[PDB]
Symmetry: C14
Subunit: 81 residues, 14 copies
């Protein structure tokens, strides 16, 4: 009853943060890999490449942070428990 909501909440938190890193994890690697390959091919373009990569890493990091925010909400701002 009262325990079920809390039990469901902690499971939801684990799933939220756990699953949220799978896509962005693979994606950040793909971006970063082509970035350093680009720098090796065109060292003078490091600034342009690093700038575009950082922008990209931020967009992908945000995806996982949405998962963290929900997990933290389920633990420390839970409106049902």
């Amino acid at each position: 009853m009262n325990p079920l909501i809390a039990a469901a909440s902690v499971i939801a938190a684990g799933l939220a943060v756990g699953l949220a890193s799978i896509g962005p994890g693979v994606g950040q690697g793909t971006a970063a890999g082509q970035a350093v390959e680009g720098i090796a091919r065109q060292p003078e373009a490091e600034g342009k490449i690093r700038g575009t990569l950082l922008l990209s890493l931020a967009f992908m990091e945000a995806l996982t942070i949405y998962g963290l925010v929900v997990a933290l909400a389920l633990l420390f701002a839970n409106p049902f428990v």
Copy 2:
């Protein structure tokens, strides 16, 4: 009964935000990777490349935000609890 709806809601929220980052995570990486590869090959085209990438990252970020919106609705604007 009353606990089951809340329990289901928090699980649904975790799933919504967790699953929603898998595709866009991989996708943003693919786009970002070819972007920095393009910049390395054609540094003078950085502006055009960064512009088209940012447009693409926004479309893909939105996919995951739909998941976040539903999760936030299930937690803080729940119509059944």
Copy 3:
């Protein structure tokens, strides 16, 4: 009974929006990646490339929006609860 329908509805909503971004997420990345690669190779064709990409991103975004619409219907226009 009455709780089961609501419980099923919130789970369905989470699944609907969560699953709906997997394909379009990967797809938008593939399209966007080849778009910026194309711009790097042929900067003069940016307009034609961006036009075709935007059309494609819209078709793929719609796929996930169908998921969002059903999720929002299950939460805020539920005909069974």
Copy 4:
């Protein structure tokens, strides 16, 4: 009992629209990606390429719409509830 049909219906709706975007999502991206690559290689063929792509996107969009139609039928034209 009476709630089981409605509960099954909302789950079915979520699955129908959620799963239906996975294939067409990936597919539309593949098509759109080769389309913009083609335009970059042969800008004079934009019309032919855009025409064939649009035809293809429609065929793939329909696949997911079948899922949406069933989901909407399960929610708003349910013959068992």
Copy 5:
């Protein structure tokens, strides 16, 4: 009892239409992608390419339509409910 058949039927309908688009979704994208690549390489062959593609898209669309037909039968021509 009477509810179980209806409950099973709506789940079956969702699965039928949902799963049926995964393969044809990916397939149509592969075909369409090589079609527009072919048009870019050989614009004079557009007619032959579009003809063969359309034939292929129809064969693949049919695969998913079999799923839709069964789903519609389970909802609106159910012989057990």
Copy 6:
């Protein structure tokens, strides 16, 4: 009891037609893709290519039709209900 057979039958039908399109879906796309690529490379061989493709599409379509036949048998020629 009596409802279980009908309930199992509709689930079996959904699975049969749903799963049966996954392989042939991907396969038809692979075949069709190389077909249009071949036509672009060798337009004079369209007839030979279209002939072999049609034969191949039929073999792959049959795979999914076996699924449809079983589904239709489970719904409209069920020997247990």
Copy 7:
């Protein structure tokens, strides 16, 4: 009891025919794809290519037919019901 065997039988039939097309579906596509690619490269070898392909398609079709045979046996020659 008596219903359980029939219920298990129809599920088994659906699984048998459904799963049996996944491998052969992908396989037939791979074979057919390289066949039409071969015809495009070497049109004079169409006969040899089509002959070897047909042999291959038969071997792969048989794999799925084993699934159909078991499904038909479970439905119409069931030794337990």
Copy 8:
């Protein structure tokens, strides 16, 4: 009890034949694909290529037949029912 053995047996039969075609399905396609590619490249070697392919197809077909044999044994030579 008595029904459980028969129920388990039919499920086992479906799984046995269903799963047994996944690997050999993909494998036969890989072999057949490289065979027709080889014939296109070296038409004079058709006999040698077809001979080695047929040997390979037999070894892979046998893998799935082991599944069929067990399924047929579970249905028509069951020592427990």
Copy 9:
């Protein structure tokens, strides 16, 4: 109770033979594919290629036969039923 051992045994048999063909199926195809590609490239080496392939097919066939042996033992030499 008493039926549980027999019920578990038939399920185990189905799983044993079903799963055992997945790896060797894919593997035999990979080996056979490169074998016929090798024969096309170097027809004079057919004997050496066929010899090494046959050795390899035997090692891979054995993997699945271990599954068949256990399945046959569970059905016809069961020490617990």
Copy 10:
């Protein structure tokens, strides 16, 4: 009751840290691999390459650390137990 929340919490912790390393694990490898490939091709660019890689590894490491933080919170800062 009191045990269920603790039981759910430890499971959630395991899932959180376990799942959170899958994506970043693959991603860090992709980035690091292209980094050392880049250094081999352009040894003079080691500094630029190492700098961009380290930035990327930090972004990807953070993804998994979010999982660790939630796990540690569930164990040692649990607000429900």
Copy 11:
């Protein structure tokens, strides 16, 4: 009770031998494929290639045999039944 151990044992045996062939199956194919490719490219190196392949096939076969040994132990040398 007494039946549960035997029931668990036969399931364990099926899983042990079934799962144990997946990796080695794919692996042996990869090794054998590059072996025959090598022989085609360098027929004079057949002896060296066959020797290294046989060593490799033995190491991979052993992986699956560990599964067979445990399965046979669970059936015919079970210390708990």
Copy 12:
């Protein structure tokens, strides 16, 4: 009750350490593979390559160690049992 927390804890520990090696396992291999390829291509760059690889291996090893730490905490610093 008291056993459930301990039972959940040991399962969580197994999952934590088991799952945590999947990503970093694949990743470390990718990095190490390109490292030795780089050394072969540019032996004079061994030091730079080994330095960047070691940094990368540490970042990836840490991912799995987070899993080990949680597992060890669940076993030997469990705050709920």
Copy 13:
């Protein structure tokens, strides 16, 4: 009770040895394949190649042996039964 521990132990043993061969199976194949490819390209390097391969096969074999050791411990050195 007493049967549950033994039942869990035999399942654990099957899983341990079954799952433990998946990675090392694929890995040994990758290593062995590049080894024989290397020998074909550089027959004079057979000794160096075979030596490094054997070292690698041992490291990968050990991974699966850890699984066998645990399985054998669960069967023949079980501390709970």
Copy 14:
């Protein structure tokens, strides 16, 4: 009670060691494969290549050993049984 903890512990041990070899198995193969390819291309660099590979194999072996350590702890240093 006492049996549940022991039962959970042996399952956890099997999962821990079983799953822990999947990633490192694939990874070690990737590294070892490129190592022997490198030796074939640059036999004079064997020492440098073998050194970097061994370092890498150790890092990857450790990943699986963490799984073995937890499994051994669950069996022979269990703090709950």
